[PDB]
Amino acid sequence: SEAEGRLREKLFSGYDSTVRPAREVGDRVWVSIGLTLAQLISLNEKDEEMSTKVYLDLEWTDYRLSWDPEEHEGIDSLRISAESVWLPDVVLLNNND
Amino acid sequence: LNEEERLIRHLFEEKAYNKELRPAAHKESVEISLALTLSNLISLKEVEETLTTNVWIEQGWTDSRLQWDAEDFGNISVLRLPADMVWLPEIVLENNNDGSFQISYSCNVLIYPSGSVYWLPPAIFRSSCPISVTYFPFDWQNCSLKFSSLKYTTKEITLSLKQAEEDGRSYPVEWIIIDPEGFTENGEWEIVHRPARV
Amino acid sequence: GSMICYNQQSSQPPTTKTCSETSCYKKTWRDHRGTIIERGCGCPKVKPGIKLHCCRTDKCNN
Amino acid sequence: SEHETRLVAKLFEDYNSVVRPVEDHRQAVEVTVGLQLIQLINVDEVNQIVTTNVRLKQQWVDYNLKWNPDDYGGVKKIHIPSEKIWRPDLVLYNNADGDFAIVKFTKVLL
Amino acid sequence: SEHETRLVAKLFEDYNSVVRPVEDHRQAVEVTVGLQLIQLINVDEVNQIVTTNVRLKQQWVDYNLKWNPDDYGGVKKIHIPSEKIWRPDLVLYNNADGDFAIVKFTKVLL
Amino acid sequence: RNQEERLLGDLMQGYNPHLRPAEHDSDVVNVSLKLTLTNLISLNEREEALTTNVWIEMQWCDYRLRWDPRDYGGLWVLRVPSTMVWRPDIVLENNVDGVFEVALYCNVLVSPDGCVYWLPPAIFRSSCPVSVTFFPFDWQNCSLIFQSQTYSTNEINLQLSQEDGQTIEWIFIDPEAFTENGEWAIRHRPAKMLLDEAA
Amino acid sequence: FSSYSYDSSEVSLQTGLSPEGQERQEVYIHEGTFIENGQWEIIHKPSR
Numbered sequence A: 001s002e003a004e005g006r007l008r009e010k011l012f013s014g015y016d017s018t019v020r021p022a023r024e025v026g027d028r029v030w031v032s033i034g035l036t037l038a039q040l041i042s043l044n045e046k047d048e049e050m051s052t053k054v055y056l057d058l059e060w061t062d063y064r065l066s067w068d069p070e071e072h073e074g075i076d077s078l079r080i081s082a083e084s085v086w087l088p089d090v091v092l093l094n095n096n097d
Numbered sequence B: 001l002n003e004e005e006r007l008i009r010h011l012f013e014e015k016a017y018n019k020e021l022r023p024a025a026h027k028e029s030v031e032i033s034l035a036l037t038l039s040n041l042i043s044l045k046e047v048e049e050t051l052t053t054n055v056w057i058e059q060g061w062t063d064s065r066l067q068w069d070a071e072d073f074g075n076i077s078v079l080r081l082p083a084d085m086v087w088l089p090e091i092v093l094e095n096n097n098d099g100s101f102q103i104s105y106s107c108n109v110l111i112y113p114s115g116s117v118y119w120l121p122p123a124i125f126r127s128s129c130p131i132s133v134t135y136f137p138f139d140w141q142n143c144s145l146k147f148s149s150l151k152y153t154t155k156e157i158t159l160s161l162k163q164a165e166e167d168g169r170s171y172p173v174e175w176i177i178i179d180p181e182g183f184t185e186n187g188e189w190e191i192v193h194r195p196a197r198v
Numbered sequence C: 001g002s003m004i005c006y007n008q009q010s011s012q013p014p015t016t017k018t019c020s021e022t023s024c025y026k027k028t029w030r031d032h033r034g035t036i037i038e039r040g041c042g043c044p045k046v047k048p049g050i051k052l053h054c055c056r057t058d059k060c061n062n
Numbered sequence D, E: 001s002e003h004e005t006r007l008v009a010k011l012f013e014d015y016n017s018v019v020r021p022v023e024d025h026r027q028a029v030e031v032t033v034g035l036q037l038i039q040l041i042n043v044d045e046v047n048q049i050v051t052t053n054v055r056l057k058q059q060w061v062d063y064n065l066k067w068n069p070d071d072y073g074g075v076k077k078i079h080i081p082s083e084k085i086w087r088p089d090l091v092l093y094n095n096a097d098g099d100f101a102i103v104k105f106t107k108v109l110l
Numbered sequence F: 001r002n003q004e005e006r007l008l009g010d011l012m013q014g015y016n017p018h019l020r021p022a023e024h025d026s027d028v029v030n031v032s033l034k035l036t037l038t039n040l041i042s043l044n045e046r047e048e049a050l051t052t053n054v055w056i057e058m059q060w061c062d063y064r065l066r067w068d069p070r071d072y073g074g075l076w077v078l079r080v081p082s083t084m085v086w087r088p089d090i091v092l093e094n095n096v097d098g099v100f101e102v103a104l105y106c107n108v109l110v111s112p113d114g115c116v117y118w119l120p121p122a123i124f125r126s127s128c129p130v131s132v133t134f135f136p137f138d139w140q141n142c143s144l145i146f147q148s149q150t151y152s153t154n155e156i157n158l159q160l161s162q163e164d165g166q167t168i169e170w171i172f173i174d175p176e177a178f179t180e181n182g183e184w185a186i187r188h189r190p191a192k193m194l195l196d197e198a199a
Numbered sequence G: 001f002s003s004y005s006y007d008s009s010e011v012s013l014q015t016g017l018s019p020e021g022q023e024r025q026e027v028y029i030h031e032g033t034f035i036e037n038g039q040w041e042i043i044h045k046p047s048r
């Protein structure tokens, strides 16, 4: 969609994906983390390791990626590649491998 | 090279192709046709509960930006492009148990003057097949390969089976394709049914 | 004793050869790309899933 | 030296790796394929897999990578990264569980 | 984050990550190294290999990554990718069959 | 860093790392090679694979990386990423797992005369045909064959390293730092340079 | 699960609310498509 392209170029003009979104200095980014267990693969006792397949569920707010839908032909949602936006650096801390 | 390079420069530089955008209106869904060819069945590891397959997945979809009239480019009727240059539905095996969601070899797409895009990536997949041990070693197993897009929803793409033709009448390919001449049967597993569903 | 068989592939222009056997065969199957037809001499043993038609007449495999 | 640098600068000024390297799109690319078997690593009878070490020699002609040696100090052969050029997409069709295509992109002799 | 975006653009506009971060080339880079042992994974007595999970804390001063917080809204601390700055090439000399150096390039606190 | 950055900027002007250094035609780039073995990890007999930890010392000279120290504040050495310089593509030919190359691409050390020092570490799994007649009282003759993947003998002259007056015709082993393998003792460790005359 | 680099003054974590919401404290398992492990039964699956 052409309007989708113009919206994407507007949002990512001057957008740095390595910078945490904080409009003021001292502002926190509230990240909400959930998990869905697709499959409990194994619990290897000799390695003391649980193998799971999961879907994370990460929700936050980036103030730089807001727009007026009526100025862009009613587009109210976008699907943007994760490398193009700022992600929280959420990792599994107790990984065994 | 002349007409091939001219057509590439017309489609991707003059027209300013954007691979990040879907080939559809914002409220419209892109129809992806899927078929599967089972090249060979490697193994079903019972203890590790894992099916290993070599499968060539055939993806078809119309991209209205990647179209041309053949008479303005020396009657060229087909073009081979890298898969990294075009928009892809990004079909993955959701049923994997080793984390290898994606296809193995990202080959070229074939585009045609109608805007149709054909892509036949081969893949080696390790999926979770739960094992029923009740009648072992006279048992039969029911494994599945579940293909979907984690990047797009039903509003963005629409999955469907491939439609083939016989004697001018179309039919959906409701099965896994196995080439009878080239297929080598697995050493311990015979295939009884090969259905395909949406 | 000899015979004339066809041996062209699929929908290629027809060709013929001399079979010393007593049958000529047509062999049809379908891979992911389309249908292949193989014509030749004799009555070979085919893998399961392949259509086979053996016939004992001159120019009988088409 | 400066002549090899000048040559590589000119050869890859208006080059397209996607285009088949022939003058006219109606003629095919002629590729010569040879297989060298270095070692038979293993034959596995259960999963029916033969793993071997090979060299896959491929020879063709790129129409757009010609030069006159007299205009470059007499250089007749150079070495180029294979990622920069068009290549045939040779695949092992009966691959079992390995790599379908070449993944080690060594240099080409041009 | 406009202040931090401005700062990050200013800091890496004339930055070269190859040479050491020292105002004069005759002074050494002072690096503080600490090792944190999270988990002792395995002791392989046959191959004589110890597998451990570690965190390798490295601290040092970069001469060209300084700023005055008053010109950037009071920003005093930031997180930047480690791949775009000079780093020490700390190698485990007695590496048996693992990785000789750090392969996971997490964020630098600046 | 100002002198270091100045030197790097002046050196990398017009430098192509994919082109072999030759100032005149028919020049052959001399490459001296040394191998240090830090630990023999294993010899898997069923795969016929010798797993070793090695440090390979490669020395060559690049006329394009020459400079005068007095023009750069007396700078006498420069550490450059190994990707940015031209390299002799030396690989272990007889590898059994498909890994031809070194494990870590560290920095090279360029000197004012243009002579480049490179010491990358490597994990190598090499093919060792196991003679099984006297197993488990056997001894094996494993080989590590190093050669250029792309260049010929008219382009590089690959030779053994020379220390003060003496050619190092052996695998070097640190007497102090070496821990002996638990199942294998190294009796001989020679090195040779082979060039078939009719090749 | 935690942010590897950012501290509490920069990124604050909270438990993921499901479509049920109501301040959930549980791992979500979709009961239709979840095939139970043949060796293991999930007794409790909380989140904190």
Ligand SMILES: *[C@@H]1O[C@H](CO)[C@@H](O[C@@H]2O[C@H](CO)[C@@H](O)[C@H](O)[C@H]2NC(C)=O)[C@H](O)[C@H]1NC(C)=O
Binding pocket: F030, F157, F159
């Ligand atoms: C490159 O290496 C070769 C040896 O492989 C060197 O050749 C000999 O060097 C000695 C000592 O300098 C001379 O006495 C011999 O006359 C050389 N023999 C040849 C073949 O000419 C050669 O000098 C090296 N080149 C450079 C530039 O160091």
Ligand SMILES: *[C@@H]1O[C@H](CO)[C@@H](O)[C@H](O)[C@H]1NC(C)=O
Binding pocket: B070, B071, B072, B073, B074, B075
């Ligand atoms: C292509 O084929 C058509 C056949 O009618 C012909 O008229 C035309 O001149 C050919 N060439 C081009 C460039 O269209």
